[model samples]
Target: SGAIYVGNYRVVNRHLATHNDWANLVWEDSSRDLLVSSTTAQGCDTIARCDCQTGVYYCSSRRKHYPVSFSKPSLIFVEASEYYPARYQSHLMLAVGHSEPGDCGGILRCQHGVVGIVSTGGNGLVGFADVRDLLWLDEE
Candidate 1:
């Protein structure tokens, strides 16, 4: 990794391998070329929680369906053969999905962008953590 200036700090830039994991307990392969910044998680926690209100995240689509809540499951990037349970822990919302919809630490992605994160999905459905409420970590 190399150093680059951003805000008031110098950040490291690293090369990512295609389809190769850089998990901090998750499975994802984002180039991070347009990344913002911080955290453990093998550097996967650099993306800030996004804001999707009004126009920031548009709602224009050809098809729409949700998991249990949203209305578009793809809107949440999850497949539930059967509905499971979602438990909240601090800043996380945990849940699972059958039909091989997820994995431990898998990212819940959508056209909107990377939204949630799987925290527990070992031999099970899935349990994810919401990123929308995690911007405090980057307050400057």
Candidate 2:
């Protein structure tokens, strides 16, 4: 039930992984998450929020399949620790790999393959495990 696999979907503690994480996530919630079939290319649109036990993670490379098919309501925000970069933020993983002398745009990759393009919505916030739960705080 873990998605932090670095190779072949094995159990890894890290959030970094290949592009196939979405594929496995799809399988994980295959019947749970709404499975919309391929559509004729156009602006005719639809969407679904990936309501999961884990926090609603931005899969980054939604260009593949999970983009429009899965997202949380409102804007997806990332919550990183001001104290230390410990949580499984995809942004951090990409930074560790592709950090240059100076750059801001490129294909985001995990340890194995491409998982995202350079389309930034530019926003906001989220509350993942062991980090914090602003989303939960709002409920109360």
Candidate 3:
């Protein structure tokens, strides 16, 4: 609904009440990144994607085409589900490479998920953390 500054990026928060999903899309200069935490209600499933230059997205998540634009590097989260009573949750965090070394990706702490950022020059996994949650219960 609004915008906030996170480091050198201007990020936007998107919410989907139907699937209890939430995402934060960040734009740094020209590149983009995103963090998503989703909880499946009933038999619904959620999937997210981003156009980051580097970093691992959802390890075992499916890909869907989102026909929207947010400059070149953008983040997207979509939900799919069947009418049922099973429940589960998924999380994804993506970061792109920066113009300079060691200045691009960062780690994220998501609920029930492991997130990490690769250092510059593919140095390795750095700033790794186990995230707790990525959902919202109330409005901010």
Candidate 4:
């Protein structure tokens, strides 16, 4: 319906029916880069270093290196440490809520209901399939 703030930025339901390339382009041009993190159940945090320009994310934590892409990344909140050694890094959570531009600090334009690379933690980019995508990785 609208836009909402998740971790460090805004997210919203895509307001259209067709694929909106313009929405992705706006995100690419407007958002900044981020180095985000998420606390693991095992007592440590997984730090993700994203290269938004290249749409790549490198999260080498818990002795595991998780390489994800902003270009074609999936959206889901992950318990990063839930599976321990295997599924821990792969356990992604589900979408929680949504957002609108006005609710998210007036910086984000619209939710646009599209998926693509967006800035977070002021340093990285990740594919946000939905509003839940924002909380997947906690900020360090």
TM-score of each: 0.32, 0.17, 0.17, 0.18
lDDT of 3 by residue, 28-125 (tens): 11111233332222212221222322333221112311111112211323122232122221232323322122222333222322232211112222
Cα lDDT of model 1 by residue, 1-140, tens digit: 12212233222211221222232212222222112233333332344345432111111121222242221112133222233334223333333342133222234544454455443333534434445443433344
Candidate 2's clash total is: 2
**Candidate 3 has what TM-score?**
0.17
Regarding lDDT, does 2 or 3 come out ahead? Answer: 3
Position 99, candidate 1: lDDT: 16
Q: Which candidate order results from sorting by TM-score in descending order?
A: 1, 4, 3, 2
> Highest TM-score, which number?
1
Candidate 2 lDDT trough over 10 residues, lowest sum: 29-38
User: Cα miss at 91, model 2 (Å)?
Assistant: 14
By TM-score, is 1 or 2 better?
A: 1
Give the Å error, residue 53, model 2: 17
How does each model score on lDDT? Answer: 0.31, 0.23, 0.24, 0.25
Model 3 segments more than 4 A misplaced:
1-121, 126-131, 137-140
Candidate 3 has its poorest 10 consecutive residues by lDDT at 60-69
Off by over 4 Å in 4: 16-137
> Which ten-residue region of model 1 has the weakest summed lDDT?
53-62
